[PDB]
Amino acid sequence: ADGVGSSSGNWHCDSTWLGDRVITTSTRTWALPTYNNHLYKQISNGTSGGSTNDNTYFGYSTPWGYFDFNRFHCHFSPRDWQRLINNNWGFRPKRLNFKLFNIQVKEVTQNEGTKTIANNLTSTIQVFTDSEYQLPYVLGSAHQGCLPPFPADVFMIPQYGYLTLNNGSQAVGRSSFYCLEYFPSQMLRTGNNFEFSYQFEDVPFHSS
Amino acid sequence: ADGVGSSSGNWHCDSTWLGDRVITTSTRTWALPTYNNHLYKQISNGTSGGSTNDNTYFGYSTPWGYFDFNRFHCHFSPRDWQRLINNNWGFRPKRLNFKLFNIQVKEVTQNEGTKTIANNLTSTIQVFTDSEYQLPYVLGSAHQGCLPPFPADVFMIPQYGYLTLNNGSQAVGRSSFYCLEYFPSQMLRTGNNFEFSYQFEDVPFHSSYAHSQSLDRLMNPLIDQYLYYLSRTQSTGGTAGTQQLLFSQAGPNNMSAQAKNWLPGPCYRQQRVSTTLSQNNNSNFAWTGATKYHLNGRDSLVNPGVAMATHKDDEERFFPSSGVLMFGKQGAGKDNVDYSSVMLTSEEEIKTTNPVATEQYGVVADNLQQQNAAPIVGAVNSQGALPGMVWQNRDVYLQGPIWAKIPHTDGNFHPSPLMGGFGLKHPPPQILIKNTPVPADPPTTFSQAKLASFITQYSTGQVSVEIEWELQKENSKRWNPEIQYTSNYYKSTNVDFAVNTDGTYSEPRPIGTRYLTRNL
Amino acid sequence: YAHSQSLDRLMNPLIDQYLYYLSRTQSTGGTAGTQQLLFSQAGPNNMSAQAKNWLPGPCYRQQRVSTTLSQNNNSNFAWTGATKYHLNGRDSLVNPGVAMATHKDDEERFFPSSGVLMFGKQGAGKDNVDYSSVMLTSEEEIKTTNPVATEQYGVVADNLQQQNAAPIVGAVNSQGALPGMVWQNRDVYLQGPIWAKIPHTDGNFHPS
Amino acid sequence: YAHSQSLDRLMNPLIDQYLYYLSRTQSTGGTAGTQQLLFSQAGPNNMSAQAKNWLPGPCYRQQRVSTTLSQNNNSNFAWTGATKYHLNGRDSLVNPGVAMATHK
Amino acid sequence: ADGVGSSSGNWHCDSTWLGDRVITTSTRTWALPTYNNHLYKQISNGTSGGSTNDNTYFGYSTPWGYFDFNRFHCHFSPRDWQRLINNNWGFRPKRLNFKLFNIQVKEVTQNEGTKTIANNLTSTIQVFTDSEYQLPYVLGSAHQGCLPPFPADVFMIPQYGYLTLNNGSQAVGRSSFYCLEYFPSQMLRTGNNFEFSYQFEDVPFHSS
Ligand SMILES: OC[C@H]1O[C@@H](O)[C@H](O)[C@@H](O)[C@H]1O
Ligand SMILES: OC[C@H]1O[C@@H](O)[C@H](O)[C@@H](O)[C@H]1O
Ligand SMILES: OC[C@H]1O[C@@H](O)[C@H](O)[C@@H](O)[C@H]1O
């Protein structure tokens, strides 16, 4: 059974080369802060300032963070990449598997000038996936915040926000507002772990 | 198994639209403080002070808090409300399911000027429901403290208190005192969770639609009636006015004279107030000219009153003084706030079957005529129920109450709440919650006096309420397009029903439920 | 049973209502009384102004008679000032009448003229017997849900206001049934009748 | 069918009621009219004063018109003196109206 | 299973009126201090002081506390007492059931002038019952310290002591000393709970 004194899962990094499959895996350590003091916030940029008409936007910045593994260097060591590109004409993803485990939650307080950090055992986190693609899909825009290339680094989970139709800085009628707490999500304490599986749709081999 | 390191339940917010059912669910995060330092307290207000005889009360304020989900905006997003009111004639609740989970309990202490908060793992909370309705039922009075409309907000559980029979500020013999610790309750630590199910008693669908016909126009415009009415009592066109009885069939020419099977709903008049300021009288008539009912020597303003049309055709600006529900815009003060802050609801759609709130129900005769005496017809300001009378209930709103508890009494007439809602004889049980008190260190030598020193403490956690709604699908042969509830097309500074720059959610306008039409 | 709560006090004494009412129609504290509409949430301070779901039972007024003799008028109003109903050219005294509270708080001595059941003490004459012989029943307990028999049901407006005309509110002496209205039936007594036969008719309203 | 009994006459003509009513509020036969409360049981003598379980049906009044012409007033009151109900700013004559006896 | 994060039992207060039985139940919250700094102490009062010969005693005061429910108001609300005495000639107890649950144990320390209190998860308490009546029976002397009449109060468990044969303040040869740690007892941490059942011996109805 789960508990505060037993680990949720194990560290895994490998590249398993078998036949025509290569299974690459990566594990990282992350730190997820509290964004916007738990607030949704309208964000916008108008032409009123030094901005031009091209740079205007309207959107919302949420408290939620998100994982981005979308860069290759996350899943391949430079040697694993070398085996790939030297020996092979093409490669395409088949399926992925994703895990959250070993969750520590820590409350930090300020007393005079000294900082102190202590475990909070009863606090939770909320993790959902959008399976039905009912959110603005923010990946694929080549934003920062991916898992580090090098497994020993700890990384910070980026904040989630999205952009919507605008006219200038003002919002039009078709502008959408998405409340992310309105999805079903799974709440995890320090003994809980999160996992799901995904299977890529058939896609033509990248031609290397 | 449960423990400090495993979550009790999961976050859920959805609207599941399947067939004639819609299952709406909501989860929030709450914080429950310690009220009255764990004391029951008599509270009362007498006429001795500046108070009048109408405002006096006697009652008790408990430590217990309670959950109130009774407003619609708790269970529906503004989009889920739009699917509802556009596509459907009626809806009624079927069953609900309610959950407490992920309970954190935290003790806070003061050292010099610095505050610190730390988990207390062994502390509990007490949660019971009154299933048998053995408590004053405090819901349905449209009090604050409901779950926020917007799921990201954390809310504070309101304190529970109740009022009892009084004479002045003093209590009479039939005054009841209820000790809430005297019920069985369930005590929960941080790994425990609480749940119960409830099933609504069969209740008539709230009718969301407008009539496409006024009540008096149900006639055929083409054909005359075979019935006769008394058109003229005096000889016409003659040099002498000697009376003669002359009769006529009513027809398309005079419809107001036709015989009709049905009468408008009952009328209890309101005072008329115009939004344009120069039209209203100069005085304060708000309380004095108000429509009141007198109960046990106390004049109680009638609010909102019986369901009655707000205004007649082509008068937008007039509204009944107490007649309409009034909602405040986000961040509106509690005292003497200007007109621009409140959102006045209006009933346009019941003009067909219901009388205008600010005008007389009709006219009746005050005397028996004679050749000597002229006929005199008096106005009817108040009209109770008469046979062959039809009316519409007040419209529910996205901000308004869902249900109310039909008082337990010998008799009632059309038991539906005047605020609008579903009158229920056994409403959802009200859920009471409290922090179990933890004593501060007692003395080392015994003393009978009860312990007045407690650890300052509060608890937080997650609450889920899931209601299954039954829908009445719209089936109509109407050719031309319906009116729908549509958001504004033109550009805006910020989106409606969404957070502003600073993070504050706001609801721009009240959304009534009836855009659809039916034949009367 | 009696209700432990009055009908208008069903509210929570602690919490304000999210509904607003019209508190003041005139500019307050200003040297000029120019009208302005001002709204307020009702709360523990003013309970009489809160929005309420339910209304008192129907009212058909009675004449008020005081047991203390010097308070009553000097005349015989028993038949003349009585509350009667006129059926087929015959005026029939309304006795006991609809169920209505006998008297309000801290008035013991007043009773409705025809409103209450009246039982005689053992060996009481049939004609013009003194007050001391009869036993007046009284309804204290329906004061919560029912109006007092000797007072008006309420007050309604008699006119449509204008800048020229002041608002005028008329009294409601008789009130039939309205939606959202609750009442208690008259109390049975040890000396009183057990049942009655509901006449056979097309329609009846709350046949008790 | 018609009822063979009026609503107020459902009583027994033979027997008195054990209930009392307020017959007289003033001292009778005395040189001074000082008020005194006096009670009586209703009986065959005064039936109009008896206690009754039931009340007549609801009433919404109509104007009275006589077929004999000289009795009616001289004017046209047909529309003006009519019993109307006001719905959405339109005055609609109440016809035939609630069920009520035509004449006594 | 028991643990620090799961409650031991539930709150119960009721009066169940069924036939000729009435089952009354009560739950309270208590606080048990540390008496005598964990010491047994001889206590005595002699005539040497202002005391007279009538007021002299010899006995021992223990660290142990004890529960006293022996007063009626513990088991009956004033309404439950009213149903009892109005409708019934006699009543006698049949059986009782007794429970300890939801035990918090807290260590308090002094630092300068500031007090602080914190959970001690590993500390225990010792609870036994004397079934064989091998102790001085201290109940029935109408001492204070019963459960409060009103369920919302928290009460303090009284200290346990007893008196023994004396001559003056001095002890005679038949004086007994009872060490309460010399009984078998059950030791409870914060997840443990204590319960036992008892069945009254047949006793004549109290005649009300
Ligand atoms: O002066 C105006 C006030 O009059 C009081 O009787 C009443 O409690 C208030 O609601 C307000 O009407
Ligand atoms: O003079 C007083 C009397 O008046 C009569 O009309 C009536 O029958 C009596 O009950 C009494 O009221
Ligand atoms: O002049 C008399 C006429 O008055 C009108 O208002 C009405 O339409 C007619 O039915 C008739 O009453």
Closest CA to A180 of A58, A56, A36: A36
What value does the CA radius of gyration of chain A take, rounded to a whole number of Å?
21
- DSSP code for A95: E
> For the stretch D8-24, what's the b/e string if a residue is b when 16 or more beta carbons lie within 10 angstroms of its beta carbon?
beebeeeeebebbbbbb
Tell me the C-alpha to C-alpha distance, in Å, between residue A129 and each of A194, B129, B500, D55, E184.
11, 35, 26, 69, 57
> Which positions ≥6 away from B84 have C-beta within 8 Å?
B22, B76, B91, B208, B471, B513
Assigned token pair, B293: 């009912």
Q: B12 in helix, strand or coil?
A: coil
Closest CA to C19 of B142, B291, B510: B142
Q: A53 in helix, strand or coil?
A: helix
Atom of ligand 1 nearest to the CA of B287: 12
Contact A173 B489 (CB under 8 A): yes
Residue whose pair of structure tokens reads 């015994």 in the numeric block: B446
Residues D25, C65: contact at Cβ < 8 Å?
yes
Minimal-distance CA residue of chain B relative to E35: B444
Assigned token pair, E198: 């008892």
Query: d(Cα E162, Cα E181) in Å, to the nearest integer?
Result: 15
> For the stretch B395-419, what's the b/e string if a residue is b when 16 or more beta carbons lie within 10 angstroms of its beta carbon?
bbbbbbbbbbbbbebbbbbbbbbbb
Residue numbers in B near A112 (CB within 8 A): 114
Centre a 10 Å sphere on the Cβ of residue E159 and count the other Cβ atoms it contains. Answer: 19
> Which positions ≥6 away from A192 have C-beta within 8 Å?
A2, A8, A103, A186, B5, B6, B7
Nearest CA residue ID for atom 1, ligand 2: C79
With 0-12 / 13-18 / 19 or more C-beta atoms within 10 angstroms meaning exposed / middle / buried, residue B394 is buried
Q: Which of B45, B53, B284, B287 to mutate to test the pocket of ligand 1 (most atoms within 8 A of CB)?
A: B287
Does any ligand 3 atom lie closer than 6 A to the CB of residue D79?
A: yes
Assigned token pair, B153: 């907000």
Report CA A181 to chain centroid distance, whole Å: 17
Ligand 3 centroid to Cα of residue D68, in Å, is 23
Degrees to nearest 5, angle at CA B181 with B180 and B182: 85
Centre a 10 Å sphere on the Cβ of residue C208 and count the other Cβ atoms it contains. Answer: 12
Q: B244 in helix, strand or coil?
A: strand
Residues C143, B172: contact at Cβ < 8 Å?
no
Does any ligand 1 atom lie closer than 6 A to the CB of residue B52?
A: yes
Closest CA to D92 of B254, A154, B145: B254
Minimal-distance CA residue of chain C relative to B403: C53
Beta strands A154-156 and A29-31 are parallel
Query: d(Cα C168, Cα C158) in Å, to the nearest integer?
Result: 5
Residues B67, B462: contact at Cβ < 8 Å?
no
Report CA D36 to chain centroid distance, whole Å: 28
Structural resolution in Å = 3.1
Across the interface, of A3, A43, A123, the residue whose CB is closest to B3 is A3
Q: Is the dihedral of CA B260, B265, B268, B274 positive or negative?
A: negative
First-to-final CA distance of chain D: 18
Degrees to nearest 5, angle at CA C167 with C165 and C170: 130
Degrees to nearest 5, angle at CA B371 with B369 and B373: 50
- DSSP code for B10: -
C and B: touch, per 3+ CB pairs < 8 A?
yes
Tell me the C-alpha to C-alpha distance, in Å, between residue D55 and each of B311, D2, D98.
36, 18, 16
Selected for mutation to probe chain B from A114, A126, A165, A177 (highest B CB count within 10 Å) is: A177
Long-range Cβ contact pairs of B79-83 (< 8 A, separation 24 or more): B80/B15, B80/B22, B80/B24, B81/B398, B81/B511, B82/B485, B82/B511, B83/B15, B83/B17
> Which positions ≥6 away from C145 have C-beta within 8 Å?
B407, B409, C3, C7, C56, C57, C182, C183, C184
Residues C16, B143: contact at Cβ < 8 Å?
yes
Across the interface, of D75, D78, D86, the residue whose CB is closest to B230 is D78
Across the interface, of E13, E34, E154, the residue whose CB is closest to B451 is E154
Residue whose pair of structure tokens reads 């400090």 in the numeric block: B4
Tell me the C-alpha to C-alpha distance, in Å, between residue E136 and each of C141, E43, E125, E128, E197.
55, 16, 22, 15, 21
Question: Number of residue pairs across A and B with CB atoms under 8 Å?
Answer: 122
Contact A42 B489 (CB under 8 A): no
Chain C residues contacting D via beta carbons under 8 Å: 65, 67, 69-70, 72-79, 85, 87-96, 98, 113-114, 117-120, 124, 126-131, 133-134, 176, 191, 196, 199, 203
Query: d(Cα B370, Cα C176) in Å, to the nearest integer?
Result: 30
Nearest CA residue ID for atom 12, ligand 3: D79
Closest CA to D79 of B354, B264, B223, B246: B246
Query: d(Cα C185, Cα C208) in Å, to the nearest integer?
Result: 8
Assigned token pair, B501: 């720059």
- DSSP code for B490: S
Residues B363, D86: contact at Cβ < 8 Å?
yes
> Which positions ≥6 away from E137 have C-beta within 8 Å?
none
Closest CA to B26 of B466, B400, B401: B466
With 0-12 / 13-18 / 19 or more C-beta atoms within 10 angstroms meaning exposed / middle / buried, residue C181 is buried
Query: d(Cα D104, Cα C86) in Å, to the nearest integer?
Result: 11
Contact B264 D87 (CB under 8 A): yes
The experimental method behind these coordinates is cryo-EM
Centre a 10 Å sphere on the Cβ of residue E76 and count the other Cβ atoms it contains. Answer: 19
Assigned token pair, C158: 């008699």
Degrees to nearest 5, angle at CA A38 with C41 and B97: 65
Instruction: Give the amino acid at E46.
Output: G
Report CA B259 to chain centroid distance, whole Å: 37
Query: d(Cα B144, Cα C15) in Å, to the nearest integer?
Result: 6
Residue numbers in B near E114 (CB within 8 A): 111-112
Q: A184 in helix, strand or coil?
A: coil
Instruction: Give the amino acid at B406.
Output: I
Tell me the C-alpha to C-alpha distance, in Å, between residue C150 and each of B296, C60, C116.
11, 9, 11
Residues B39, B452: contact at Cβ < 8 Å?
no
Closest CA to E60 of E179, E145, E184: E179
Query: d(Cα C167, Cα C162) in Å, to the nearest integer?
Result: 8
> For the stretch A24-48, what's the b/e string if a residue is b when 16 or more beta carbons lie within 10 angstroms of its beta carbon?
bebebeeebeebbeebbbbbbeeee
Closest CA to E99 of E11, E200, E2: E11
Looking at the complex, report in whole angstroms how far the Cα of residue C58 sits from the nearest Cα belonging to chain D: 13
Residue C30, CB half-sphere, CA atoms under 13 Å: how many?
Answer: 9
Residues B371, D70: contact at Cβ < 8 Å?
yes
Assigned token pair, B5: 């390191």
Query: d(Cα E208, Cα E203) in Å, to the nearest integer?
Result: 15
Residue numbers in B near A177 (CB within 8 A): 495, 497-499
Torsion-angle region of residue B175: left (phi > 0), alpha (psi -120 to 50) or beta?
Answer: beta
Q: Is A55 annotated as a binding residue?
A: yes
> Which positions ≥6 away from C142 have C-beta within 8 Å?
C99, C100, C101, C183, C184, C186, C187
Ligand 2 centroid to Cα of residue C69, in Å, is 21
Assigned token pair, B457: 């403490």
> For the stretch B191-213, what's the b/e string if a residue is b when 16 or more beta carbons lie within 10 angstroms of its beta carbon?
bbbbebebebeebeebbbbbbee
Q: What is the DSSP secondary-structure string of B43-96?
A: EEE-TTSS--GGG-EEEEEEEEEE-B--BHHHH--HHHHHHHHHHEEEEEEEEE
Question: Number of residue pairs across B and E with CB atoms under 8 Å?
Answer: 117
Total residues found in chain C within this entry: 208
Ligand 2 centroid to Cα of residue C159, in Å, is 38
Assigned token pair, B463: 């609450």
Residue whose pair of structure tokens reads 């109940």 in the numeric block: E139
Assigned token pair, C15: 């919490």
Query: d(Cα A20, Cα C65) in Å, to the nearest integer?
Result: 106
What value does the CA radius of gyration of chain D take, rounded to a whole number of Å?
22
- Helix, strand, coil share of chain A (percent; to 5): 10, 35, 55
Across the interface, of B269, B283, B326, the residue whose CB is closest to C39 is B326
Tell me the C-alpha to C-alpha distance, in Å, between residue D48 and each of C82, C94, D8, E18.
12, 9, 8, 52
Query: d(Cα C2, Cα B111) in Å, to the nearest integer?
Result: 52
First-to-final CA distance of chain B: 58
Helices (runs of H) and strands (runs of E) counted in chain E: 2, 17
Long-range Cβ contact pairs of B501-504 (< 8 A, separation 24 or more): B501/A41, B501/A42, B501/A43, B502/A41, B503/A36, B503/A37, B503/A39, B503/A40, B503/A41, B504/B330, B504/B331
